[PDB]
Design a protein around this ligand. Structure first.
Ligand code: NA
Ligand code: NA
Lengths: 428, 428
């Protein structure tokens, strides 16, 4: 990559949630291997982010690579309308088997946001078929479910800046963010959620939440008793429960799916990110026979959705290989050890002036700061320390690949602790 | 693939817009090469569909394969937050250069529907930044723009069954479907409906969104280019943004590189997908102007508020680059022109068949509209038996073959279509 390549990127290529008028520096990556990213200048960075949850097995994984190349040799893509193929069948077999018993019907899609849209549409079509006027969703404040319009309608109105779209987005119900920490249960935490359910139980199509960990909305970690109760309340009212595990799925919190922390099963489950081992985009929405059949027996005679690249053989083959790595069970002890090391190594941030809170769960470590980070200065600092850590707002957090070496994880935690010692890298 | 595999697929795997209770047969594909799909059982089928537009270069293309394998060796994926890479830069360079001059800022995404959502959000954020209360979209009937909530809100209300979501979807403006034909003559009576809507709703319209020249999923309609000229001028005069959805028409399918070229106009926002990667895997792009991109970044949010996890996916970008490189030869023009002449000549006899209502051809798109709905299971079996993969829908039996299709292969397709419509056997 030439300097001119970088200049073109700056003036012509949009990046996630960042200004085109006041763009901040981006770092050119040429390749990646193991748990490291390699910059154009040759510098190697220990990846602390897993490219946002997904790369649970790191980069250039020989098994993932071989499975992808082998599927390319057969066919990278063929349409799924009137056609099926081995990669999709193998993936759906695994997904059905590894999730709770009732979840046995799979709708594959391309991205997390679309998977949520699918889940929401399932809930709406389900009630339409039953002849019930139910079009509201009940969710938690500080939640995040994606950027398409349906998903946006259940995201935190504040974090997701709903004022920008006031009048376009449907108005859903937002219960207070769960207070009880992943800590002791306080029954008073339920008063808000209960109030909403009482006033709106008749019109709620589904409850949608991120189980245990609220990611993009604040990297919050709450008590599993919340899920147990929500499941009981939904059962009681006949309301569908949608669990968005696009971030928590596939071992990240210490259990295969975060719903396990409460031994609960949702009616609808959304999966993405780590599904393919972070090699390429793919998502899945699973639901029950009751939901799937009810929908097909309604007026449309089917579930009204079908993306062009649905069931993409290549992505399915990548996901199959990624799931096969997890089948060994090694991730269990890898995450447990990462959790101990995160707890042990981030503890000192509790003595730092710029820190508001420290919390760890599984292979997730979060240092919340008192002031917003200076994105440009702090990103450069991390790069200079030989690590790739991507902060945002008042959060400096780590979600490393499960295969990360202890000395690599240590470089990450040391960098985090050094960043929070004084006001140098803060505000802007 | 065993019969047990096929049973599992039927019981547990949803497919595009089809029942989970009364599913029709799906054919197992094991591989694909050139212009052929290879069924598990060994039968080879000439592909007439390009897996829904996308596979313009066919299957197992050497250049696409090589580019994909090479990228896997470097990195299949890395996050785009704070990072850039060669595949993304090379792809965006190509997209900026090949599209009209004003289109110089690129937002990469995962799927066509997401690209449309991005375009819609760009329009909404644009006006919000300018302090204008514009939230409505003006579109045309028989339009199709994707399956997510925003996209659905601009799809034809009859075809997409908007009654399922009445009360959830925002209510947009729908001008009559364009009547003047691409083969035929311009009738100024065509404009009254659109003019009436614009005059009455000008001040609240954020953007006009249309599929240029060909309305795909909404009826495989082919309308006169004067429409686009007129719309562009009206938008220019009223200060309204024009979104061209070229997710199906892009990259040469209608005889020109982009269908907008037929009217020699450029939109403010351009959506691309399907054939972008040569139909190897999912990827999309939304291009806009500097005026739009900068205005949004100068507003409240300080940026365009979108950023999918797999944004800029290196692997998909490498595939798209290889696909565009093939198109750079200019060869597609002659290929598409030849396909067009053969389609016109060989579908012509179908105009005399009792079961045919209309025959229309444009570029590498050949359509035979019938008087009655086709019998999906029976007609699909017929086509497979003739050694062709043609996927009909409703009253439409259409062809959109890979540009590399041989004349003999194309003849098998047209022969099969003509035979399918000579009597009512495969109808109702
Ligand atoms: Na299951
Ligand atoms: Na351009």
């Amino acid at each position: 990559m030439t300097t001119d390549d970088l200049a073109f990127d700056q003036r012509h290529i949009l990046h996630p949630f960042t200004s085109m008028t006041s763009p901040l520096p981006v770092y050119p990556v040429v390749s990646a291997e193991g748990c490291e990213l390699i910059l154009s200048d040759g510098r190697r960075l220990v990846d602390g982010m897993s490219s946002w949850w997904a790369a649970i097995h790191g980069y250039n994984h020989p098994q993932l690579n071989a499975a992808m190349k082998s599927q390319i040799d057969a066919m990278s893509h063929v349409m799924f309308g009137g056609i099926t193929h081995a990669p999709a069948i193998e993936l759906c077999r695994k997904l059905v088997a590894m999730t709770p018993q009732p979840l046995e019907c799979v709708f594959l899609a391309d991205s997390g946001s679309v998977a949520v849209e699918v889940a929401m549409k399932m809930a709406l079509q389900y009630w339409q078929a039953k002849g019930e006027a139910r079009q509201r969703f009940l969710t938690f404040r500080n939640g995040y479910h994606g950027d398409t319009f349906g998903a946006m309608s259940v995201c935190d109105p504040d974090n997701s800046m709903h004022s920008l779209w006031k009048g376009y987005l449907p108005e859903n119900l937002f219960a207070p963010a769960p207070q009880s920490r992943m800590g002791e249960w306080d029954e008073r935490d339920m008063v808000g959620f209960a109030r909403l359910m009482a006033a709106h139980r008749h019109e709620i199509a589904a409850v949608i939440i991120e189980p245990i960990v609220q990611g993009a909305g604040g990297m919050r970690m709450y008590h599993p008793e919340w899920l147990k109760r929500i499941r009981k309340i939904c059962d009681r009212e006949g309301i569908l429960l949608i669990a968005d595990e696009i971030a928590t799925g596939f071992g990240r919190t210490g259990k295969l799916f975060a719903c396990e922390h409460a031994e609960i099963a949702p009616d609808i489950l959304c999966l993405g990110k780590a599904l393919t081992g972070g090699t390429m985009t793919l998502s899945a929405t699973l639901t029950t026979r009751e939901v799937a059949e009810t929908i097909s027996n309604g007026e449309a005679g089917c579930f009204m959705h079908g993306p062009t690249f649905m069931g993409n053989p290549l992505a399915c083959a990548a996901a199959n290989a990624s799931l096969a790595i997890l089948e060994s069970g090694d991730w269990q002890q890898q995450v447990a050890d990462i959790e101990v090391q995160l707890r042990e190594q981030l503890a000192p941030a509790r003595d730092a002036e710029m820190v508001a809170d420290v919390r760890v769960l599984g292979a997730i470590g979060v240092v919340e700061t008192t002031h917003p980070v200076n994105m440009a200065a702090l990103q450069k600092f991390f790069v200079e320390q030989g690590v790739w850590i991507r902060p945002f707002g008042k959060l400096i957090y780590l979600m490393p690949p499960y295969i990360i070496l202890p000395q690599q994880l240590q470089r990450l935690t040391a960098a985090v602790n050094r960043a929070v010692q004084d006001e140098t890298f803060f505000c802007q």
